[model samples]
Target: GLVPRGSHMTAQTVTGAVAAAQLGATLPHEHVIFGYPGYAGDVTLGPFDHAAALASCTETARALLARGIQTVVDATPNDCGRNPAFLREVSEATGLQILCATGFYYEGEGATTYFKFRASLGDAESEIYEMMRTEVTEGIAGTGIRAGVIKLASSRDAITPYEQLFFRAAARVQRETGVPIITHTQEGQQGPQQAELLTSLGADPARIMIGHMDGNTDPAYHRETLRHGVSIAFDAIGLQGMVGTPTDAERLSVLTTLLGEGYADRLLLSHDSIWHWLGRPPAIPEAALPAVKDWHPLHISDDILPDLRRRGITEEQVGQMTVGNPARLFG
Candidate 1:
């Protein structure tokens, strides 16, 4: 229970494995360097400015550290300009534990890379499983930086055939290595659908995090997803109004209500914020920037936590959602 209080459980990090207990005040879903919106336009190669990008990312990590974040899970997928070397540099600069993910994004959004092409081949499940296994066990792209978690994704309202194959392969790897599996749920849909497929394939629900659950506001939807014994992430904390996503107030109302309902241990908090976007300038839309301006790693500490405390959420409950639950998943 409670993951052996952290020490005995090892969490794989960019540098190496660390005690699970050491992952203090962790942000389970974050992006140090993400290439999106423009990635599809420039899918041929990476055009990131290494020095500029690293400095920007390091500053974000430093800000989080100053606010007491000890660990960050870099949820950048392989097909999405995931730079292990860059993340390693950022970790060194900030002295924060950075855990990188090994997997692909949802085919609907990700580039037409290996995951897409390989799905057309026979024995696709085995091929995909081997790719993930190599990254987790051997090393990602021969960088010797093994991924600490498995990331998978499904489209809005449904899991595509390619995504189904991905879940099967990811489940197999998780079974072999016992690594935690995190997922992306578009428009907050298909979380329960994802859980059903993963658990049916023998992936432990307790070790899975169904991310972007905050994008949907229905308490009934969250309750049904949590019934699978899997954790749900209200990770898009500061993202509001875009695509009609819930605001901070709306999200907090739902989250606090869930906490009061005794689901604190099954909740994870993060911003799902992307600090650096590879390949170009104006990574985000000019009109939407102001709306998402507060969408940063520090939003939880600087704004959300204080409000939660004021709204009758005890400090112990905050710890359970931010620190305890995340450690449990990794441990």
Candidate 2:
């Protein structure tokens, strides 16, 4: 009944199934371990220590739990060192519902050599769809941990044929499984294009989320994207000093404006922060550390919500974004 009917929507987690109502105060996007492509090739970032990585992620997970975050969606795709076994261990240790993603990263910019080799192996669309569907239905990498959401991505202001193939595959699986789709929009561009493409490919707009829309300061772009009736994630809420990423203040401004404009139910928020990344010590640059220091899962609960309230955003709107919206998305 939870497979295709969409009645009593169930969110698949690393541990097991979770009812929509039970997914409380969810941080819809975050990562426990994200080993970027080439981390293995580069000696500076190679030799991932599984024990240390799990320990570090466990600390972060506990911290989030202390802040009342009951669920977290790990958006790391396969090529990016997505480890379901690691996530399951963390979930078991932390008593938190960790949702793993099934899909691919943006091939335009983030794709690895493995993706290219795999693409050359079969009919791109069917092959991708089968891989993703197998993960959702059976398990990921033989771990028996199903994915809760379908992850897709597009380049800044453009979607390559390679990327479009992934999107169409994701759309097909979403239609078959009733699973929600979440996406990455480079520098906040191509949100509308992604919405259009996914919807045109037979995916429900309401079942999709356009991610990284916070990187752009243009409110009009967000408004247009939201017009498609899909949710958009202000997932990069705290990161700064990127070439074109907006500041937290600017993100709050757009978020408050959108909420006031009656888009509360269709909005999602996250820090897009990672607990522990693979590689060497300085996975993040020292210059970017300060901006990222407070960019954890609790950033919203500690700072953004209070600031939003001071700016006239009601508690009800915050609830809609943090609780009601995520519930409806998976449900």
Candidate 3:
């Protein structure tokens, strides 16, 4: 009897555009599965196990559904194995909505040899814009599976010339399609610079999110980035002392400070958890395993939210961060 849909609040998913109101709680940043660039070089052992990925990703999807998460943005990198079909299958199998991404990773760790070389021959800006714009308006890699968001990343403390070209290109696409853009800040660096560059290029600040704020413990850095009127994500939740990021306790402290200062609607949280790690899975030393124990998808639902409530963050504030903000952005 209540078959209503709000076109104003529609967000594209792997399957199709869905009303964001229908997308209740959302993890705006996370990976269903991804490999670093050159994972393909390990051809013998690195063959993608579709069946294995499907099984594992399905299980993770079901867990998020049970925890009241209705939507997830799969921010997999362009050079990495960003499987549109793989994502669609997981969403279809588990009845969980997933949004795939378009665009490349940062210069340092990402595959940039081709683009970098092309720059020496000629400017690669148009090519970058065409790919991202085509992916959003048409479909990715000739697959009819459309991506809902644009993903971009940069080096630590700097946006290299190559990465800046991408930002410029992505800005054009964002302005053209109204598809929101998400970013990777290396080890919690360059949030301010990312915002400045994109916004300077005419990209709407509200449509961009500076991700991985949880990687840093300083509240001043968070404030500096948030000043751009762009939403910021503490998406790397539950990751402790790994890759220079601080612990969950320190994250909570900075987060609470932001909440107290009236920036609730400008915040988002996710675990940045990866359901499947492609390539040869590295053997984590026995002692290292416990360090990432809380880095699961359920960390937010099981631990972070409860801790926030205890710190006097109201349910309305929680809903704003978890649902309303994302809905507004993608809408």
Candidate 4:
């Protein structure tokens, strides 16, 4: 549950995400089926091939079992979420438990769907709670794969009126369901801000998680936020050239420092790998490309975990971030 529900497998095609599901330990932030922005476009029903996705997921699951991944959470939230039936299909095929998400994201003007219905942040917060109750109890659109965590996002600016509403709602939802909260922050510093907002709203800090902590230069925010009892999401820990980010090696150095400082149980690692969600070639085209080029080599490579292992990040440390920490949050 420390994993965000709305995260999709980047460039995995639709089938590839499910296929790749079994690759490692647990894919904490990967999406089962995701498409944002103009890609969110029009979603038409395909041939309804449950068997193919399951078959693909089964292969991936075998790979993960071989590598040691036992569970996979589908990080797709409701508004930008995937269908529960689809998740069930993959779970049944791969024999991997599929957890889903419940919440909203930060769009240019606002988030889609539910947020659009409520007028104020307060109203939105209340509505988010209701949505959580329904999803956790009745199941997403009645398909029956209950999400295990509350998913939300915030910008680097901290609390916007609308964003604050989401923070408040997430807090409320946690109280109601005892489900942990996972966030998508603007850069890295916002992780602590998310902790502040959630704690201010009365959510248990120990049950919360701040994601994308790897996007910044300083580790102060990370240290401080971890002090609040919130887990640190070190996702996107690999991209270096794209945003002048610390290289994977540099990130490992920080992780070493954090662990040395007694933050081992709080770390989580993942590459925000995208076969294409980030767009082709130029990354952002006219817009910003999220990070710089050569971030992970042009091919995006097949073995990111192997890359990390070579960098001196042990499987034990990786497990602390991916499996152990997430299991604590999700459970």
Candidate with best lDDT: 3
lDDT for every model?
A: 0.85, 0.83, 0.86, 0.59
lDDT of 3 by residue, 1-331 (tens): 1111222224789888888687789999999998899988986987878899899999999999999998999999889889998899999999999999998889888888999888888879988898888888888878788889999899996999989889999898887777888998998789999999888988888788999877778899999999888999999897777776788899899999999999988899988888898898767788777568898899999999999998899999999999988887665
| Residue 21 local lDDT, model 4 | 28
Q: Candidate 2 has which clashing residue pairs, if any?
A: none
Candidate 2, 30-81: lDDT as tens digits:
8888867766676654677878888888888898889888899999988777
lDDT for each residue of candidate 4 in 1-331, tens digit (9 for 90 to 100):
3342322222111122233323335555556555453434433532334565566556655665555556655566565535667666666666666666777676442335456557444466667678776765456675555666667776667656666766776677676656667777775656777787787777876667677787765778678888777887666654664544566666666666786676767876655433222111223654334443433211112355566567676778766666677656665
What lDDT tens digits, residue by residue, belong to model 1 across residues 5-106? Answer: 212225789988888788989999999988764564764565667788888888888889999999999898888878888889999888999999988889
**Better structure of 1 and 4 per TM-score:** 1
Give the higher-lDDT candidate: 1 or 3: 3
Off by over 4 Å in 2: 1-9, 43-45, 115-121, 283-286
Question: Which pairs in model 1 have colliding backbones?
Answer: none
Q: Count the backbone clashes (under 3 Å) in each candidate.
A: 0, 0, 0, 18
Q: Which pairs, if any, clash in model 3?
A: none
* Model 3 spans > 4 angstroms off: 1-10
lDDT of 4: 0.59
lDDT score, residue 36, model 3? 90
Mark the 10 consecutive residues where model 3 has the least summed lDDT. 1-10
- The lDDT, on a scale of 0 to 1, for candidate 3 is 0.86
Ranking by TM-score: 3, 1, 2, 4
